[PDB]
Structure formats: structure tokens, C-alpha cells
Design a protein around this nucleic acid. Structure first.
Lengths: 277, 277
DNA sequence: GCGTAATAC
DNA sequence: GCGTAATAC
């Protein structure tokens, strides 16, 4: 059906400033099978300054050896669930050394599934996240609302002291333009009133801006996730669940927020952010 | 390799008393696939007064309709994990109505996985259990030891007021005769020193007697579980993990403790107990 | 429900 | 590790 071709990368700030930092985020949905699907040859080409991975499904002991073979991303940090083995998990790889690296959001109820790494750098503080899925039948919908409130107060406090960049799978399509089939999904995980109101309260509270919508407020059919079933990806029946939210003070540095719709290895695709620090 | 033919059923007490009650236990390892594997036609033939199922892997909402089509086992009771969906789970079906039915062992740490049903009858109190597996690599070995102590104090208190029958997957081979390959499994879940000492402390504390060993103290190669891998069952490379433990006062009623080595539908086989109440 | 990656045992 | 039954998403 309908198509989307991501525009060419703009590497120049609105004030003419050239791009310094290139961040990349990707929900790999199985880091080991992603590695097996030649996913790591792709990021070697993208050459990002920072790499954020979500849904690694891989305890820190089982990490493949080819991760230690990325000559430009040697500082690697991982978070994993306390108990469950092939579930959730996030990772943050960096070309430069972070000043401080912290894990989780400071409330033990939400820190048992390895969902958040916080990497503080010189000019800003990066946060990569993998928000809990409300799940089919919406069993975790009530829990998800408790998470969103505590995650918002956690982010609001970080931005209080330093410019903030949130990134990763946020497991919500903000608006009707952010998914292919809006009407039939008002009662499904990812496009419920409560999840969408929560994303809205996030932008308003810390505060943050959706990078992609700030540069392309009216671009439709631009998705980051496609269900493996029903040939969803070949038909571009997708969802935009992967984001880059910036502090308002960082918008003069924003050069481009990209969506690599063609990169394989996962039921998500990578997203890239160009900043000028 | 070596073989085992379960002897014919003895339905007469040592004191000449005839059999009243016929209990049956079976770790079905997937109640729905077990039903699909014609497992329920088997128990219709066995015609037991009570049926105990372990590792149902089936929440109470997803129970098949053919369970309500057992005309001789209409009183059905189920336990399931609080959160995990296709994991653990035990069930107790009965021809007669129990006086009281309780769930779990009275300590919330061990009651979140649906492992114990307690059914009090007129002459005795039946308990069916599915003991936590220490797991490959023995991650739950320390937890398993905490369970065994609390499960023993729970059983010791039940037998304090009524004769007791424990049954189900106890996830331990007591002695070297209770598994095919004793030497190579001293460091594996099911035949560790700690698990075996725990089973021993159980028999001594409440107290209880292994029905099968009381009637066949020297019968080897008699297993209830066979790994699905390595063609373990066709080679009788097995483990005796499924038991019937009685209060000492009930031994004059014991007629026979059986092992149906030939019944399919699971990587465990059913066990049957004949009592004369 | 259906595709895929990981599980416990 | 390998067979099988169930998972989350």
C-alpha cells in the first residue's frame, strides 16, 4: 500500500551550526539474533557517536563476542532484569566516555526489569528507555500508568539540572498520524487514551519536544515498528513507537531526526538523531 | 537398555481389608496439550476417586471444556500463578466433595506460583504439590532450600491434626536407586545433596513414608520422569520424582503404590495409590 | 489470534 | 546444551 521515503540527512543547524554528535537508537528484539541477522554490520556503517539498544533479551553473561569488536563504541553499558532471562533489557554504547552512568529511575518497583540507562555527558544527559508494554488484553495497563507518572517525575528532575535527550521504544503512538490504523486500535496496547495522555503529560511536564514532529509535523506513514505477522512491514502497516525527545533548550542544536525504514534484523527499525553541540 | 514392568495392582490391605479409595497423580506438563494428546481418555479408564495434576501451565480462564465432561470427577479445584501465564499450576479433581479446600502453604513468598492445593476429607487430608525446580545451573537452589523448610513445617502442622497424604512432583530423586544415572547428576537439579537431605528431613519431621519404597524397597529402574531429549524414555533413562507420602498411621491402609510406566501424553507418567479406609 | 526470539524444565 | 509446551510482543 502506502509508502514512506525518509528524506536525506540534514547535518546543519538552523543557525548554520554543523553537526557534532550522531545518536542512534534501535529496538533489536533479540540482540543475539539481531547480531546473527547482520545487524551489527549496519551500525558500523551508520558510525554513530552513541548507540542505544532496547529489548536485548540477553543477560550480561551471554553477550556475544562481536560486541567487543566495535572499534568506535568501546564504552558499553547494559541493564538486565533481576530474574527473567530472555526478556526486556537495554544497552548503551558510546564512542566517548560518559561522566556518570546510572541505571533505572529510582523506584524499586520499576527497576526490576532493566529498562533505563542514564548516561550523563558534558553538554547534556542522555536517557535510553524501553517503556513497559500494556500488553494484549491490557493486563499491565494500570501498572503502565503508574510507570508513566514515576518516569515523568524522574525525567523532570534530570532536566532540572541538565539538558536532556530521551530515546528508545516509548511504546505509544502519540497521535493518529503516528500509526497506520488509528481507529481500530483505540482499545489496544500502544494507542489507548491513557497511554496517549501519558505521553502528552510527559512533553508538558519536564518539558520535552518530539524531534521528528518538530521537523516534520505533518509527515504521515512514517513508522518505526511493524508487527511480524500479517506481512505488516511489506504493507507499511506500522506504528511510530521509537522517539527522540529533547529539552526545549536543545532545539537550536537539532539538525535532523531520521527514520531508517529499510534496515532489517528486527521488527523495529533504527532511528538517528543529529545534534550540533 | 534396562526395563521395568510395574507389578499387577494389589487391592487388599495387609490386614485383609479391601480397597476404598483410588488416588492418581500426574504431572501433565501442559494440561491443554495433554488433553490434546488423549490424556483424558486415559484417566477415564483408570477411574480414580481423586485426580491430582501438576505443571498444568494453564490459567483458570483457559481451562478446556472437556474437563467439565468428566462425569466421575465433577468437583474440580485449580491453583495458578499470580502473574506468569504458562508456568507451574496444579489441579485437584474429586469424585466426592471435600470438607475444606485451601491453597498454598501459608507464606506469601512461596504462594505466588500456584504449587499446592490442600483438600481435607473425612478420614484424612490430601495435599498435592509441585515443588520448585532448582533449575539448570542451580539458580533457585538457595530458594529451593528455603521452600523445603517452610513446606516441611506446613506439612508437619497438618499431620498434627489429621492423617496426611502428600502427592505430586516433588522434584527430587531420594536415593541412588531413584534415577538411572546417579553419579553424573550429583551436581544437577534433582539429585543435589541439599535437595536429597531436604527430602530426608521431610520424612523424618512430619513424619511420612515413601509408599513405593515401603512396598518395593529394592526395586530399581522404576522411574516417573523421562527427559524429552536424548530419547530418554525409550531407553528408560529416567528419574523417580513423583511420590505418594503417607502418615505412619495410614500404612495399615496402604494396598499398593503403582507407576503407570506406559501412559503417554507427557514427559512424566501417572502414579496411582490404593488405600483401604 | 499470528511471526519471531527467548524462555523453564 | 536438547525436545516439548507456553509464553511476551
Amino acid at each position: 500500500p502506502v509508502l514512506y521515503e525518509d528524506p536525506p540527512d540534514q547535518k546543519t543547524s538552523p543557525s548554520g551550526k554543523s553537526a557534532t554528535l550522531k545518536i542512534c537508537s534501535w529496538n533489536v528484539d533479540g540482540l543475539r539474533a539481531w547480531i546473527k541477522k547482520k545487524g551489527l554490520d549496519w551500525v558500523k556503517e551508520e558510525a554513530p557517536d552513541i548507540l542505544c539498544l532496547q529489548e536485548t533479551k540477553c543477560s550480561e553473561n551471554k553477550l556475544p563476542a562481536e560486541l567487543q569488536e566495535l572499534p568506535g563504541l568501546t564504552h558499553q553499558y547494559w541493564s538486565a532484569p533481576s530474574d527473567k532471562e530472555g526478556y526486556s533489557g537495554v544497552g548503551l554504547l558510546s564512542r566517548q566516555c560518559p561522566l556518570k552512568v546510572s541505571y533505572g529511575i529510582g523506584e524499586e518497583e520499576h527497576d526490576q526489569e532493566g529498562r533505563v540507562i542514564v548516561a550523563e555527558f558534558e553538554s547534556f544527559v542522555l536517557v535510553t528507555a524501553y517503556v513497559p508494554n500494556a500488553g494484549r488484553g491490557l493486563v499491565r495497563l494500570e501498572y503502565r500508568q503508574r510507570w508513566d507518572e514515576a518516569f515523568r517525575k524522574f525525567l523532570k528532575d534530570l532536566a532540572s539540572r541538565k539538558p536532556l535527550v530521551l530515546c528508545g521504544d516509548l511504546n505509544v503512538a502519540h497521535e493518529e498520524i503516528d500509526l497506520r490504523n488509528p481507529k481500530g486500535n483505540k482499545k489496544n496496547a500502544g494507542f489507548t487514551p491513557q497511554e496517549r495522555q501519558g505521553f502528552g503529560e510527559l512533553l508538558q511536564a519536564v518539558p520535552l519536544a518530539d524531534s521528528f514532529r518538530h521537523l516534520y509535523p505533518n509527515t504521515a506513514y512514517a513508522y518505526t515498528f511493524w508487527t511480524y505477522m500479517m506481512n505488516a512491514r511489506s504493507k507499511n502497516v506500522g506504528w511510530r513507537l521509537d522517539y527522540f525527545l529533547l529539552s526545549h533548550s536543545l532545539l537550536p542544536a537539532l539538525c535532523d531526526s531520521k527514520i531508517r525504514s529499510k534496515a532489517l534484523g528486527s521488527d523495529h527499525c533504527p532511528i538517528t538523531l543529529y545534534l550540533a553541540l
